[PDB]
Short mmCIF file of C-alpha atoms and ligand atoms in Angstrom, two decimals:
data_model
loop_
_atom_site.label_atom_id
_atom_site.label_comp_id
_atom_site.label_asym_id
_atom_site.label_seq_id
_atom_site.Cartn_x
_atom_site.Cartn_y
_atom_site.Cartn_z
CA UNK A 6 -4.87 -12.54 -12.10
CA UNK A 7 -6.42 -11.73 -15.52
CA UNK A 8 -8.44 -9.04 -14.48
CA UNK A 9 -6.30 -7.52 -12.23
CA UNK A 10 -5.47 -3.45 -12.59
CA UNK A 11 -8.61 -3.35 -14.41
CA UNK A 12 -10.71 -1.28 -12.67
CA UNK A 13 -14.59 -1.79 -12.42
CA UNK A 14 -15.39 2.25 -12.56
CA UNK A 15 -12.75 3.54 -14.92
CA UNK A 16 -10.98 1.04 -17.07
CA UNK A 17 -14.02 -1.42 -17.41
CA UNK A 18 -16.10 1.18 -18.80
CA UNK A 19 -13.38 3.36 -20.05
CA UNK A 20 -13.90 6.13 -17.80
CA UNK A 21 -10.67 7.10 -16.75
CA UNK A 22 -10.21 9.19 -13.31
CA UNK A 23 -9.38 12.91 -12.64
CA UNK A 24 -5.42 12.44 -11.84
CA UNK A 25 -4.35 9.34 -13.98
CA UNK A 26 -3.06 11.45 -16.98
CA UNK A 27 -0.20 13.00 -14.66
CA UNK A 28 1.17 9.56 -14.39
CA UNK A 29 0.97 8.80 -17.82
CA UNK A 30 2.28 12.24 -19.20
CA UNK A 31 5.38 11.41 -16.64
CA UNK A 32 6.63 8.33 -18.62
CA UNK B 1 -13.67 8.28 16.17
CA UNK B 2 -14.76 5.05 14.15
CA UNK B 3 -18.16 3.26 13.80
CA UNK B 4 -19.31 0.14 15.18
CA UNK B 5 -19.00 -2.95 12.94
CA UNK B 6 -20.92 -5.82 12.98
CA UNK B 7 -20.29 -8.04 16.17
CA UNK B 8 -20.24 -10.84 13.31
CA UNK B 9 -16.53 -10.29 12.75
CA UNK B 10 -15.06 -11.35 15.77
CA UNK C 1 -1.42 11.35 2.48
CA UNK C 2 -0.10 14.83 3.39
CA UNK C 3 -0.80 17.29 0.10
CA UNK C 4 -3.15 13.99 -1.28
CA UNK C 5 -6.22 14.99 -2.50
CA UNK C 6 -9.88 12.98 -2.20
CA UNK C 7 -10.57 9.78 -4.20
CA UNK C 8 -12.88 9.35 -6.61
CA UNK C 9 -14.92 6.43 -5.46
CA UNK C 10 -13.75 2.89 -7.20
CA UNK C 11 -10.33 5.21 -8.06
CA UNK C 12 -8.36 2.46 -6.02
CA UNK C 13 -10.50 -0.58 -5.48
CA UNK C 14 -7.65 -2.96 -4.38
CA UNK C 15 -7.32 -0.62 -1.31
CA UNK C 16 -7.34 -2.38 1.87
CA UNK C 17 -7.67 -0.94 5.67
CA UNK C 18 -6.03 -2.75 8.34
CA UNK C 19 -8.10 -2.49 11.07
CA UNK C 20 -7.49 -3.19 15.14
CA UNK C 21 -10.21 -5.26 16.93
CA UNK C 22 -9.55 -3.59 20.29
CA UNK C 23 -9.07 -0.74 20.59
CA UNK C 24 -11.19 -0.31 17.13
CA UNK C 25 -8.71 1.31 14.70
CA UNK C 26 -6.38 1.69 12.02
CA UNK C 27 -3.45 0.47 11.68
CA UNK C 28 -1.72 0.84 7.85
CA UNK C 29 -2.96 0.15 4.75
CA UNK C 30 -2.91 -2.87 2.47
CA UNK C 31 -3.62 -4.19 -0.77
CA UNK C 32 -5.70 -6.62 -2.61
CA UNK C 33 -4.19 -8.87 -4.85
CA UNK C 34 -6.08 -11.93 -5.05
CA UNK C 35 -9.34 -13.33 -3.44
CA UNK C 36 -7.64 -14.21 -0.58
CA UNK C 37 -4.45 -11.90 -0.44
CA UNK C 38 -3.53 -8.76 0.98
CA UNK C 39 -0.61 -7.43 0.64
CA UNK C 40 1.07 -5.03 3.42
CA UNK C 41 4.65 -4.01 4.97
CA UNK C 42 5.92 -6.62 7.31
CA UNK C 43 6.39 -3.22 10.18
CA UNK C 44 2.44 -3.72 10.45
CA UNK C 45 2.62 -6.65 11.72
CA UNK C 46 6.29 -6.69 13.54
CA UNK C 47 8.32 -3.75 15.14
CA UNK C 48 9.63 -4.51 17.88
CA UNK C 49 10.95 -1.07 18.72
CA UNK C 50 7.60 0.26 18.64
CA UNK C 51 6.50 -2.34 20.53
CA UNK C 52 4.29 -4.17 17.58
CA UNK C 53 3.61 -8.05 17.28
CA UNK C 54 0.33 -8.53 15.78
CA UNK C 55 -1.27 -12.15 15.34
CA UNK C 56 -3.79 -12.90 12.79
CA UNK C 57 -6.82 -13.23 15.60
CA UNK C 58 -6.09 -9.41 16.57
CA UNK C 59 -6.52 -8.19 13.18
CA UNK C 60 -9.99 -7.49 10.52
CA UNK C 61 -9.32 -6.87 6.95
CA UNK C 62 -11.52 -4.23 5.79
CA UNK C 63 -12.17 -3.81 1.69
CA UNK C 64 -13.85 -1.80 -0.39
CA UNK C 65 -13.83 1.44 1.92
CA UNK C 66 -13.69 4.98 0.61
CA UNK C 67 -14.75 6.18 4.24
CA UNK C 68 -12.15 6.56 6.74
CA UNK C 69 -14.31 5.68 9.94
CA UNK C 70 -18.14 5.15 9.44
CA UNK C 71 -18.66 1.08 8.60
CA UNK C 72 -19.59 1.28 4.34
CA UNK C 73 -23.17 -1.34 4.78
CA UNK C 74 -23.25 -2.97 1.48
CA UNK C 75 -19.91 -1.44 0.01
CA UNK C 76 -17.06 -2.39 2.14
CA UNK C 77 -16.63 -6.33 3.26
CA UNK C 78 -14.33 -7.33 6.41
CA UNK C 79 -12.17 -10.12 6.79
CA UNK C 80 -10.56 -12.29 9.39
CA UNK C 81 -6.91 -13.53 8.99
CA UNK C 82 -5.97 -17.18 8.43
CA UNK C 83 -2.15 -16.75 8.22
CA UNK C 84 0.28 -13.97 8.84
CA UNK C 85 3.42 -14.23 6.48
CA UNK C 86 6.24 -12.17 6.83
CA UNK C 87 9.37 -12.09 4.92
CA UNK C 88 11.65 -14.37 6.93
CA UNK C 89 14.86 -11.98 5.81
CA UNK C 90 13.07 -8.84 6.73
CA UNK C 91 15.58 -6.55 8.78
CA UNK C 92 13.23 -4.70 10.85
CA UNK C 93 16.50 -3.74 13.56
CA UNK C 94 18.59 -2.34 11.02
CA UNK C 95 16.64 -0.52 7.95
CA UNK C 96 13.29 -2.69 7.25
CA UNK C 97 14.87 -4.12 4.50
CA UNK C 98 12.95 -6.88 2.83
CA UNK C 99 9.78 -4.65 4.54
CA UNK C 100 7.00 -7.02 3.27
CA UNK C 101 4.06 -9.49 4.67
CA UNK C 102 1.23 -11.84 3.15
CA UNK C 103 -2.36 -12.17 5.09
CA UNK C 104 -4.08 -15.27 3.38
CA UNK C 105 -8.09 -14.13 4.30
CA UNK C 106 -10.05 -16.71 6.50
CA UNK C 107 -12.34 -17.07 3.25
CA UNK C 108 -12.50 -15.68 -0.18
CA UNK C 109 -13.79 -11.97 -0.67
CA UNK C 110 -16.06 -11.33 -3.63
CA UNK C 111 -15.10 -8.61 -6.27
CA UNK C 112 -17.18 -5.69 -7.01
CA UNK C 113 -17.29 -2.27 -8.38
CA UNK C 114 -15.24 -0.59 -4.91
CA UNK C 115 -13.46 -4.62 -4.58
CA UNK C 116 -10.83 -5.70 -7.22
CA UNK C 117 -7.11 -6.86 -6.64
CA UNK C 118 -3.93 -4.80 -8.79
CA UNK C 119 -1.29 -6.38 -10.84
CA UNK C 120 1.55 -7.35 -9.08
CA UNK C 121 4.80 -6.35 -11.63
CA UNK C 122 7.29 -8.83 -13.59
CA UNK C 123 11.02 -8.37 -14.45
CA UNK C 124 9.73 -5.95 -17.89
CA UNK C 125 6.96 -4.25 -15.67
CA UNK C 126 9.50 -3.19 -13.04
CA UNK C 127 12.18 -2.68 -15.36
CA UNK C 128 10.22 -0.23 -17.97
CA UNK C 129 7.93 1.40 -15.17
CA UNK C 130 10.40 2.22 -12.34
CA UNK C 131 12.96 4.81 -13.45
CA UNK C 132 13.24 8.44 -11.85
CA UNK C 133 11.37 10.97 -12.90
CA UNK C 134 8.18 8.47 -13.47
CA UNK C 135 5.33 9.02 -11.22
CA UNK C 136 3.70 6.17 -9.20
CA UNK C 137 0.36 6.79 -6.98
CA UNK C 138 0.00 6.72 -2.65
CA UNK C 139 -3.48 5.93 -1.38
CA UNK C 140 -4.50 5.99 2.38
CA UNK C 141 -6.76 6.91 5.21
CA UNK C 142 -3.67 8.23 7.41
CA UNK C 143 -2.32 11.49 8.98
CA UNK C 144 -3.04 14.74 6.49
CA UNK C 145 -0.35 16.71 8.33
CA UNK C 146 2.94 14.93 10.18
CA UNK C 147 1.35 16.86 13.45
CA UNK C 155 -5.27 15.61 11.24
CA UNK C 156 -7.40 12.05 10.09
CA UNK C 157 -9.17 12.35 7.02
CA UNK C 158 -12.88 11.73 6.12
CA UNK C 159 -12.37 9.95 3.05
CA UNK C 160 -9.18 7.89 1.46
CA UNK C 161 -6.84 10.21 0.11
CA UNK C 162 -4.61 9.91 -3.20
CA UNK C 163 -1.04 11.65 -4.19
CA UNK C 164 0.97 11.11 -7.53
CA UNK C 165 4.62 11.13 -6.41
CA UNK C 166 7.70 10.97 -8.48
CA UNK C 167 10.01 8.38 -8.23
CA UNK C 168 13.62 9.93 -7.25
CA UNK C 169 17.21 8.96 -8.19
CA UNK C 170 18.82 6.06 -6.04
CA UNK C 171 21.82 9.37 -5.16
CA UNK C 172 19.37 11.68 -4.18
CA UNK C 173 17.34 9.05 -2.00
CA UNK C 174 20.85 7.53 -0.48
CA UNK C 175 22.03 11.23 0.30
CA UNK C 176 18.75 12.23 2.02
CA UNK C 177 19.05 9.99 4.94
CA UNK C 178 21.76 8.51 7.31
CA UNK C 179 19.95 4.73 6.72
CA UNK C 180 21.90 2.54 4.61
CA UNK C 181 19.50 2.03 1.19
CA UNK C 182 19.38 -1.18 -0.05
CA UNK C 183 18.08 -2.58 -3.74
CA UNK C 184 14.68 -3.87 -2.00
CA UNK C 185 13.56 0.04 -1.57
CA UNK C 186 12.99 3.18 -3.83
CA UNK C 187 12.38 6.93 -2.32
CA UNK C 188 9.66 8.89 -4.14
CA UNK C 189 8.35 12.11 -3.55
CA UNK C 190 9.38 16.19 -4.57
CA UNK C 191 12.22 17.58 -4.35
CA UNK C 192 12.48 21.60 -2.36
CA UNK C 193 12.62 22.87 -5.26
CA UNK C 194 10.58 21.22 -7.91
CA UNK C 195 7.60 23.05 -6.95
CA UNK C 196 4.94 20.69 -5.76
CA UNK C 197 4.95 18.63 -3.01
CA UNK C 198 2.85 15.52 -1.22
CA UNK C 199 3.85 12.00 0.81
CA UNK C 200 2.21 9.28 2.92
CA UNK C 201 2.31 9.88 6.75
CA UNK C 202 1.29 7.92 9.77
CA UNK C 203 -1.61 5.49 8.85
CA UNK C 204 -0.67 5.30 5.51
CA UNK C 205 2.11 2.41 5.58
CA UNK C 206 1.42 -0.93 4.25
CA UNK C 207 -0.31 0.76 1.60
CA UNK C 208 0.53 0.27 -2.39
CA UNK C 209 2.39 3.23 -4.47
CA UNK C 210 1.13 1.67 -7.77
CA UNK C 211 1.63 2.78 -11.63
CA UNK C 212 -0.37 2.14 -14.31
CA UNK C 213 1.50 0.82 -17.35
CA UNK C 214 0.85 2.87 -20.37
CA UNK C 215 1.23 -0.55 -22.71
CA UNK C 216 -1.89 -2.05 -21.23
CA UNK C 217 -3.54 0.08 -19.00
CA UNK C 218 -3.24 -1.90 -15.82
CA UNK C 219 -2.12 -0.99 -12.45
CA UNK C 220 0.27 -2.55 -11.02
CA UNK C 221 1.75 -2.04 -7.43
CA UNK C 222 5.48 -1.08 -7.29
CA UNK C 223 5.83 -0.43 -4.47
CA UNK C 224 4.59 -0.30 -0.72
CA UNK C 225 4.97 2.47 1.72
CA UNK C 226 7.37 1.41 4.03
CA UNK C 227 8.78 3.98 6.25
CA UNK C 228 9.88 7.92 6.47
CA UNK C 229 11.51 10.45 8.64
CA UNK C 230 8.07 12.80 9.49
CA UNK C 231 5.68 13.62 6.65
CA UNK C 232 6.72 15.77 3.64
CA UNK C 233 9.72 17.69 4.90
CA UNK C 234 11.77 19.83 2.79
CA UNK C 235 14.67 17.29 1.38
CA UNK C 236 12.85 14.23 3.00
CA UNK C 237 11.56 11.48 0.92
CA UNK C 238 9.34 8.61 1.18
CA UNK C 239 10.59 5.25 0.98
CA UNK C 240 9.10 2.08 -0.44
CA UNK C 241 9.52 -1.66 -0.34
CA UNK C 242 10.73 -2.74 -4.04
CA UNK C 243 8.03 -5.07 -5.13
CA UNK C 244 9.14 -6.68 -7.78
CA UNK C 245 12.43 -7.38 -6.28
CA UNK C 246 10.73 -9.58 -3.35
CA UNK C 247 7.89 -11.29 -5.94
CA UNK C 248 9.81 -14.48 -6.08
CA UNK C 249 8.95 -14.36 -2.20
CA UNK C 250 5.46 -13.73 -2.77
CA UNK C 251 5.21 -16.20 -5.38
CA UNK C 252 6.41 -19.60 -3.70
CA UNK C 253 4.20 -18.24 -0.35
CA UNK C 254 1.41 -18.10 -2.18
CA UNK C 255 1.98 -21.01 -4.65
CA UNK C 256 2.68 -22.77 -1.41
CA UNK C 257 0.06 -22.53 1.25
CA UNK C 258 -1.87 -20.23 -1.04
CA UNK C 259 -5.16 -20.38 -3.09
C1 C24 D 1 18.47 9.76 11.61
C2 C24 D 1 16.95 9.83 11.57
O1 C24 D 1 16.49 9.84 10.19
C3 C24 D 1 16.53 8.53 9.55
O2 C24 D 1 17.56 8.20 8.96
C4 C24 D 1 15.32 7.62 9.56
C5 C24 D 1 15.23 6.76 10.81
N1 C24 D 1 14.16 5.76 10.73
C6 C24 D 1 12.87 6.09 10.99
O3 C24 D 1 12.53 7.26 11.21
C7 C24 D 1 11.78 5.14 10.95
C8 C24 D 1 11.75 3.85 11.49
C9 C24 D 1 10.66 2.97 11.38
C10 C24 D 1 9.59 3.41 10.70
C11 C24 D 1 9.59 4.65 10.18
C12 C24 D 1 10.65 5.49 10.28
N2 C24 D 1 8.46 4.94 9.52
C13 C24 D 1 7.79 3.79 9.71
C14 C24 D 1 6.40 3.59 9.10
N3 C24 D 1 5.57 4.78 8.94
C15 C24 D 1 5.69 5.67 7.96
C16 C24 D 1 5.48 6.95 8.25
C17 C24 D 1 5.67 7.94 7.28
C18 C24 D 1 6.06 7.63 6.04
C19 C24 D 1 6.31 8.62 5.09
N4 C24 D 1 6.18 9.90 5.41
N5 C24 D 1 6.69 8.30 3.85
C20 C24 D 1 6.25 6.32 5.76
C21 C24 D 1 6.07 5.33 6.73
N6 C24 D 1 8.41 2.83 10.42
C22 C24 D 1 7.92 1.50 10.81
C23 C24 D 1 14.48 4.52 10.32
C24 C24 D 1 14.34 4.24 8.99
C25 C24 D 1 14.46 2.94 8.50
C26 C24 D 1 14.73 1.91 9.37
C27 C24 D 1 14.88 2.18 10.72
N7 C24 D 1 14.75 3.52 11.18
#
């Protein structure tokens, strides 16, 4: 897809979600 | 413990 | 998810519930990653040993849920199955190897703000993303403790652990097709995916261009966050060539 792991509610608007920046700060 | 769906989806 | 915490609503829209027509209920989790694909581990559908053989007419797809039992009016959007798929090398009497399945959706689900597939990875995806250390995310509406249900879907961040340390937690030979993630005794925090939570995506979001893609899918584990136990997952990427000619096959 070309939209795909875009999300509506975070990335879309980019609003990005309470956890997300553990992931990130782990690679 | 779950709701009732609409009857549609079977 | 055992030690998960609540989701934010639209936090994982390409999470899928795979729900029982009679008796009503849940059986794993699943993932959206087209208009008419779900993804899920091929044990939801077939294990023998637990005495599962599923056919598409005893199944409903249900997307866009955050709830965990009361039917979402106007959010969520069920599905019938058209065609079961499952990996015709999957070793479900040995160690689920190959632990993977397709369900092609009777018709075409619209997207929306809680409804919108993830990225499945590529040879640079997988190979950049999935190294130890690097945490992926578990979703689900399973088990909260390995022996209850939760309200609302639940979310964990979960390291992915060394191919030694996952080999040398278990007595089940590994193979390349998985990966183990989870804490180790020591490291502090802890967290996993439980009963009700299989079939469901462990996905990353690349930090090149934001997406999510799914890594991995929850494919089995001894309990539910046990000291020195781990959680293992079906290697997506490694199986895609699967998932591509089934869906570039019979798929739209
Ligand atoms: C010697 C005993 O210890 C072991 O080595 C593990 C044995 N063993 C199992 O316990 C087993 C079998 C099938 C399973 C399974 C676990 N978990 C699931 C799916 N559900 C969950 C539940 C929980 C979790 C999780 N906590 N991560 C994941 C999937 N299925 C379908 C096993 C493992 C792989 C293949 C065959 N058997």
């Amino acid at each position: 897809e070309a939209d795909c792991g875009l999300r509506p509610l975070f990335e879309k608007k980019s609003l990005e979600d309470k956890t997300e920046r553990e992931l990130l700060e782990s690679y | 413990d779950f709701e009732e769906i609409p009857e549609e989806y079977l | 998810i055992v030690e998960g915490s609540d989701a934010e609503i639209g936090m994982s829209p390409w999470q899928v519930m795979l729900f029982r027509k009679s008796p009503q209920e849940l059986l794993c989790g699943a993932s959206l990653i087209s208009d008419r694909w779900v993804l899920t581990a091929a044990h939801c559908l077939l294990y023998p040993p637990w005495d599962k053989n599923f056919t598409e007419n005893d199944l409903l797809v249900r997307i866009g849920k955050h709830s965990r039992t009361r039917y979402e009016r106007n959010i969520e959007k069920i599905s019938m199955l058209e065609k079961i798929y499952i990996h015709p090398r999957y070793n479900w009497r040995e160690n689920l190897d190959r632990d993977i399945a397709l369900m092609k959706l009777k018709k075409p689900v619209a997207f929306s703000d809680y409804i919108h597939p993830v990225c499945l990875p590529d040879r640079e995806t997988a190979a950049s993303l999935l190294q130890a250390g690097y945490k992926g995310r578990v979703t689900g509406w399973g088990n909260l403790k390995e022996t209850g249900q939760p309200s609302v879907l639940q979310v964990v961040n979960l390291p992915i652990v060394e191919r030694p340390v996952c080999k040398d937690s278990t007595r089940i030979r590994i193979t390349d097709n998985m990966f183990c993630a989870g804490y180790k005794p020591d490291e502090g925090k802890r967290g996993d995916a439980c009963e009700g939570d299989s079939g469901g995506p462990f996905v990353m979001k690349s930090p090149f261009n934001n997406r999510w893609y799914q890594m991995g899918i929850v494919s089995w584990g001894e309990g539910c966050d046990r000291d020195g136990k781990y959680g293992f997952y079906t290697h997506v990427f490694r199986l895609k060539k699967w998932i591509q000619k089934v869906i570039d096959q019979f798929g739209e």
